[PDB]
Write a protein that holds these residues in place. Structure first.
Motif, short mmCIF file in Angstrom:
data_model
loop_
_atom_site.label_atom_id
_atom_site.label_comp_id
_atom_site.label_asym_id
_atom_site.label_seq_id
_atom_site.Cartn_x
_atom_site.Cartn_y
_atom_site.Cartn_z
N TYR A 105 -153.56 47.43 -60.37
CA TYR A 105 -153.39 46.53 -61.44
C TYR A 105 -153.43 47.17 -62.84
CZ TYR A 105 -154.21 41.92 -63.74
OH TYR A 105 -154.14 40.75 -64.51
N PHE A 106 -154.41 48.04 -63.04
CA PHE A 106 -154.58 48.72 -64.32
C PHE A 106 -153.34 49.64 -64.61
CE2 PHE A 106 -155.70 52.80 -66.45
CZ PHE A 106 -155.80 52.30 -67.71
N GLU A 107 -152.91 50.41 -63.61
CA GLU A 107 -151.92 51.40 -63.81
C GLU A 107 -150.56 50.80 -64.16
OE1 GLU A 107 -152.72 54.40 -64.66
OE2 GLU A 107 -154.52 54.79 -63.58
N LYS A 108 -150.25 49.63 -63.56
CA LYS A 108 -149.08 48.88 -63.94
C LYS A 108 -149.15 48.40 -65.39
CE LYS A 108 -145.44 45.92 -62.61
NZ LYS A 108 -145.10 45.26 -63.91
N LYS A 109 -150.24 47.75 -65.77
CA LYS A 109 -150.42 47.33 -67.15
C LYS A 109 -150.28 48.51 -68.11
CE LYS A 109 -152.03 43.09 -66.26
NZ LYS A 109 -151.31 41.91 -66.77
N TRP A 110 -150.81 49.66 -67.72
CA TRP A 110 -150.84 50.82 -68.57
C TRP A 110 -149.39 51.32 -68.86
CZ3 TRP A 110 -154.40 52.44 -71.75
CH2 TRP A 110 -154.32 53.70 -72.32
N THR A 111 -148.64 51.56 -67.80
CA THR A 111 -147.25 51.91 -67.83
C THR A 111 -146.40 50.89 -68.56
OG1 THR A 111 -147.45 53.14 -65.85
CG2 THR A 111 -145.20 52.42 -66.41
N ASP A 112 -146.51 49.61 -68.22
CA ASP A 112 -145.76 48.58 -68.91
C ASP A 112 -146.08 48.48 -70.38
OD1 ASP A 112 -144.68 48.09 -66.45
OD2 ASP A 112 -145.65 46.11 -66.25
N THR A 113 -147.33 48.73 -70.78
CA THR A 113 -147.70 48.55 -72.16
C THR A 113 -147.32 49.76 -73.04
OG1 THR A 113 -149.53 47.07 -71.49
CG2 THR A 113 -149.64 48.10 -73.65
N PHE A 114 -147.42 50.97 -72.50
CA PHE A 114 -147.41 52.20 -73.26
C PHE A 114 -146.32 53.23 -72.85
CE2 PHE A 114 -152.05 50.95 -73.82
CZ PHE A 114 -152.00 50.70 -75.13
N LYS A 115 -145.72 53.16 -71.66
CA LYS A 115 -144.73 54.18 -71.20
C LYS A 115 -143.28 53.64 -71.18
#
Length: 115
Positions: A105-115
């Motif tokens: 869950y975190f890693e998806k949010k991270w990628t979607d928000t910042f990458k």
């Protein structure tokens, strides 16, 4: 190098966006193992084995008080929460599964928000 800089990435929204991601992690139904520090008096083995305990409440306090110099140091503490969980918990346990789910869950949010 000296007087030679890559173009300036806008980081002015990072604080706010890390807070929002953290809110979403706090309110996930599988967050319950991670909301508060593990009680080191009541959980045999934890103190000795887990050299750097981390939890969402501790990340939230660090975030609110300017203790993350940048968004990578924030991601390091979130990942630490899950790495600790994997170190101490069997994959086939409720807490073990919670940890894998939250990391995904975190890693998806991270990628979607910042990458």
């Amino acid at each position: 190098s000296m007087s030679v800089k890559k173009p300036k990435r806008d980081d002015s929204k990072d604080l706010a966006l890390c807070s929002m991601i953290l809110t979403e992690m706090e309110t996930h139904e599988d967050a319950w193992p991670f909301l508060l520090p593990v009680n080191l008096k009541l959980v045999p083995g934890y103190k000795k084995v887990i050299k750097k305990p981390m939890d969402f409440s501790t990340i939230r306090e660090k975030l609110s008080s300017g203790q993350y110099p940048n968004l990578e140091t924030f991601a390091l503490d979130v990942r630490l929460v899950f790495d600790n969980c994997e170190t101490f918990n069997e994959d086939d346990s409720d807490i073990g599964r919670a940890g894998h789910n939250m990391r995904k869950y975190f890693e998806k949010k991270w990628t979607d928000t910042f990458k």
